[PDB]
Design a protein around this ligand. Structure first.
Ligand SMILES: Nc1ncnc2c1ncn2[C@@H]1O[C@H](COP(=O)(O)OP(=O)(O)OP(=O)(O)O)[C@@H](O)[C@H]1O
Ligand SMILES: Nc1ncnc2c1ncn2[C@@H]1O[C@H](COP(=O)(O)OP(=O)(O)OP(=O)(O)O)[C@@H](O)[C@H]1O
Ligand SMILES: [Zn+2]
Lengths: 468, 179, 469
């Protein structure tokens, strides 16, 4: 076993070796040389490692008693479904705290984080714990965030061991090779496009200072829920002026080109500063665009910049790895766009996990059932079978539980009463005829359901007429 | 055709239906429109002046009790022209190679392939399939006896094309099948 | 005066009606110069039971639209604008908002002032722009035109404000005669409604440190600005409850109005502590900061409207039934499709005499409103919604009003379905391909799907037809 696990071209195997030479595994021979060798090999060839969230566990963070949710490892998309106030953003916030503590290791912005505030403890109890686990190329690295109330400290204690080791791995890898890829810790909320503008952008702090473009500042203002459009503008101005590595601008442009059907030729305006885009041969500014277009613009620009900064001297910058959290991915989008927002993201940003929250079924009949979690009454329930290619009405009635036809309406109660009259012994009654005429005058004589009802009426006429 | 319009055979409450547009409410999508409404839209869009429309439009009743001009694409519910029985007939006196164009223009002008009409006449296939589920030749005979009865009812053109393109129904009508 | 129509009009004018009294007011003014004053007095005195609505708008060069002459209905109080991302929905609402600003400057807020068409609001490559809005009140059409011309072309349109000035004149005359009189609520809500719903540092910041006067006027302050003044609502809530020692029934009629939208909330009570507002959620007392975004938005949107309506209504039994031109934008924001099916009917039942011109990107909101009240903007043109969008399945509305397919258009399991259908309805039924794809589809969708069972019926019939032959 020990000889078999010895590998020369694998660090995932050459991390269990580091754990063996030492203790806590089998009480085996301790030393300080082979441990050094298999820790040097632990971070030296980490190419193709996807950092992913393995599983989560909550104790009383906001409204929950207990929840053990396991995320996918094959499909790169997870969708959370629930009513208003069913704790969908609570999971996102717990993962956000976990990512804040994961940061400050490879970000090197101290070693602070985000503990559980008093208003986040469940109403009327004395302890809470956000237990988060991870995975980077096989190995699992745990986290526990603990928060007690005095007199009850013997219930939970923070560990932070897994991230304390994972940040050690990444810091060693950087100290060995400065040209090493890094994971993304992006997080986006419903306040995403609250900054997209170029008003007074010359006197703003973004375009006022000598911003350093490196591989550790890309995590700045990442776990806040806002996409800094002004810093993107600063970056774009430098990439468009220093040209007088041209793939840096080209690759970023040719993803916003994909998400925006009909946008081309982004160019700087050295007049009062603004960004110029062409919408079908019509030059337009950022302020003159629509809310959804600006939202996708800011999101894609933020990911492109934060991932080209993390992967220096690469041939395909927009592959990387990262854990990007998006709240309300259907925000200010037409259902035509809420049907391809996810596959387009996975074609452009492939090796990135997306734990997203949705309020629409159009973005849900594009994802497998096994990658959709429904939250109800503080408990997890998995989605029904057959959602990837299903009609929106079926998804609405089986995963977003709602009648496909308005429960309170003059034309749904009437329809159900008309059906009850038809499928009975009074199909030819005057009331049934009156309701049928009333529904036909509104839905049209050629509606799909009324044709079926008329067909059944004709059949029953014939059957009561050949035996009479 | 007391309660039935000529172009599409829907049941009304030359009589023509409302064409998916109540009264004359304007600014309507030119894709839900059929019969008279889409015909007027075609007239306005392509600037046609001669509004006689007799000679290039063939409607089911004026035809010599024949409906073989039309096929029935059961995957979508579209009424489509047939190469046969259209390359072998002339209407009002013309070359035999123009009846196909007459039928195609009639389908295009009236727009009988609206998604509404397609999804409506698609349900007749479902109703005819449900009878042929228990594989009882008596109920299917009864279905044909009611579908091929006088006083033509709702969608009495597909109601005949469906019986046409069947082997059990045609054989039972002929006499080679005795239930 | 001719005793044929003037006498007929004065017969109804003496009975009491704003329209009837106003009909002869413009007629008289051989001019008499005193009948006009008497008719103005009668009209300003007879503004009871009025309802303010917007009738029609017309754009010329305002941000992409080169011509648009839409009109709004008067038999229903909800008009939903539907279209693709970036066609015309926000532009139209902004065009209406400019006119509402020019009217708010003349009803209550100060005097003649407003906003015009900026250079970035004029369509590229043109030299003029216009936003023509026509208002209606009690049955009278007050026009208004906002114009903007680039240099060298100051002859195409001139900004005329010849209806809003007179409407404000009538309202100031009414306010002078009777201090107790309702005024039309004018509110604008953008995608930025719930960005200031937070009771953090309320005592330190303004709206607590400054003395506020809750006059009938000034209730229009920061109304056509997007964000909703939830912090001013917190001040209003505190200067009430703390003034319980009016001040009870106003909060009763606001609390039961806010509780109708939130199914399980009760006991709105203030907290004299580091200041915050506490709600109850199924026997669990919690604060506004501890609520959800989807619930915080519906709290801030309707509490603000209720506060403004109570401020504008002096002593009415029901202060939330006045008249309004509220312009909520993206009403489907942060709402589950279960609340998106009641947001509009609940608003119309609670705020009865209020007009809403809203925008919607979700069929769930759409299939509860008639076609006549839905406008679709496809290329640059207004198209009315298809027949039957009240009581219809969401998928039919999606295909026929949103031009989005029921099933996904580029999925592997949806491109297999059409190939399976083609094989089934061709002569290759009951073939090895037709069974391989059939088995795959049955495994994916289960052996109970509505379409697959119908395809099975078809293949069963064809097997029957070829066996008995
Ligand atoms: N400290 C707490 N004590 C008791 N209940 C709490 C506490 N914190 C949160 N809650 C409850 O849990 C809910 C918060 O969940 P959350 O805001 O994440 O809902 P959501 O579904 O994600 O948002 P949306 O409505 O936009 O979909 C609230 O409804 C609140 O009642
Ligand atoms: N000054 C202008 N010149 C030319 N075109 C313009 C101008 N201003 C706006 N447009 C065009 O008109 C659109 C304006 O989008 P708008 O916000 O008004 O519609 P929308 O339906 O609300 O979109 P969304 O819902 O995504 O916010 C833009 O997409 C832009 O292309
Ligand atoms: Zn017809």
């Amino acid at each position: 076993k020990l000889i078999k696990k010895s590998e020369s071209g694998d660090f995932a195997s050459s991390y269990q070796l580091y754990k063996v030479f030492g203790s806590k595994e089998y009480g085996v021979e301790p030393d300080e040389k082979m441990s050094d060798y298999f820790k040097e090999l632990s971070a030296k060839q980490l190419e193709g490692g996807q950092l992913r969230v393995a599983d989560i566990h909550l104790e009383n963070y906001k409204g929950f008693e207990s929840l053990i949710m396991d995320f996918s490892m094959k499909k790169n998309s997870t969708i959370l479904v629930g009513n208003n106030g069913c704790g969908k953003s609570t999971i996102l916030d717990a993962i956000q705290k976990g990512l804040t503590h994961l940061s400050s290791r490879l970000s090197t912005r101290s070693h602070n984080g985000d503990g559980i505030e008093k208003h986040e403890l469940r109403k009327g109890q004395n302890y809470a714990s956000i237990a988060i686990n991870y995975d980077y190329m096989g190995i699992r690295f745990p986290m526990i965030i603990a928060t007690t109330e005095p007199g009850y400290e013997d219930r939970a204690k923070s560990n932070y061991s897994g991230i304390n080791e994972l940040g050690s791995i990444f810091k060693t890898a950087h100290s060995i090779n400065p040209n090493v890829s890094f994971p993304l810790i992006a997080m986006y909320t419903v306040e995403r496009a609250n900054d997209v503008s170029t008003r007074d952008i010359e006197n703003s702090e973004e375009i006022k200072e000598a911003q350093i473009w490196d591989k550790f500042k890309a995590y700045n203002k990442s776990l806040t829920g806002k996409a800094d459009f002004k810093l993107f503008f600063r970056w774009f101005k430098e990439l468009i002026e220093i040209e007088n590595n041209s793939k840096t601008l080209h690759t970023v442009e040719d993803a916003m080109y994909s998400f925006l059907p009909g946008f081309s030729n982004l160019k700087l305006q050295r007049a009062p500063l603004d960004l110029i885009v062409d919408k079908n041969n019509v030059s337009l500014s950022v302020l003159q665009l629509s809310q959804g277009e600006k939202t996708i613009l800011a999101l894609i620009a933020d990911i492109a910049r934060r991932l080209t900064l993390l992967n220096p001297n690469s041939v395909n910058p927009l592959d990387g790895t990262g854990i990007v959290l998006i709240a309300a991915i259907d925000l200010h989008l037409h259902p035509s766009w809420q049907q391809n927002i996810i596959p387009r993201l996975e074609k452009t940003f492939k090796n990135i996990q997306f734990i997203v929250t949705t309020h629409s079924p159009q973005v849900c009949h594009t994802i497998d059932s096994q990658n959709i979690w429904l939250l109800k009454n503080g408990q997890k329930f998995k989605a029904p079978k057959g959602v990837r290619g299903a009609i929106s009405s079926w998804v609405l009635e089986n995963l977003f539980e709602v009648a496909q036809r308005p429960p309170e309406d003059k034309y749904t109660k009437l329809l159900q009463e008309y059906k009850n009259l038809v499928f009975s012994e009074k199909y030819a009654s005057e009331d049934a005829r009156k309701l049928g005429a009333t529904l036909s005058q509104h839905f049209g004589p050629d509606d799909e359901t009324l044709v079926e009802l008329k067909l059944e009426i004709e059949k029953r006429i014939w059957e009561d007429d050949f035996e009479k | 055709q007391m309660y039935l319009c000529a172009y599409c055979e829907i049941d009304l409450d030359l009589a023509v239906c409302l064409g998916g547009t109540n009264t004359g409410d304007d600014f309507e999508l030119p894709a839900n429109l059929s019969c008279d409404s889409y015909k007027s839209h075609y007239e306005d869009k392509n600037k046609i002046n001669d509004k006689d429309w007799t000679g290039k439009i063939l409607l089911p009743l004026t035809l010599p009790d024949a409906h073989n001009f039309f096929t029935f694409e059961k995957v979508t519910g579209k009424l489509l022209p047939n190469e046969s029985y259209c390359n072998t007939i002339s209407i009002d006196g013309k070359p035999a190679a123009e009846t196909l164009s007459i039928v195609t223009k009639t389908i295009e002008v009236l727009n009988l392939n609206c998604s509404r009409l397609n999804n409506a006449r698609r349900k007749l296939l479902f109703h005819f399939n449900n009878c042929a589920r228990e594989r009882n030749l008596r109920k299917l005979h009864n279905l044909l006896l009611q579908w091929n009865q006088g006083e033509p009812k709702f969608f009495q053109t597909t109601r005949d094309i469906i019986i046409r393109d069947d082997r059990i129904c045609q054989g039972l009508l002929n006499g080679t099948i005795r239930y």
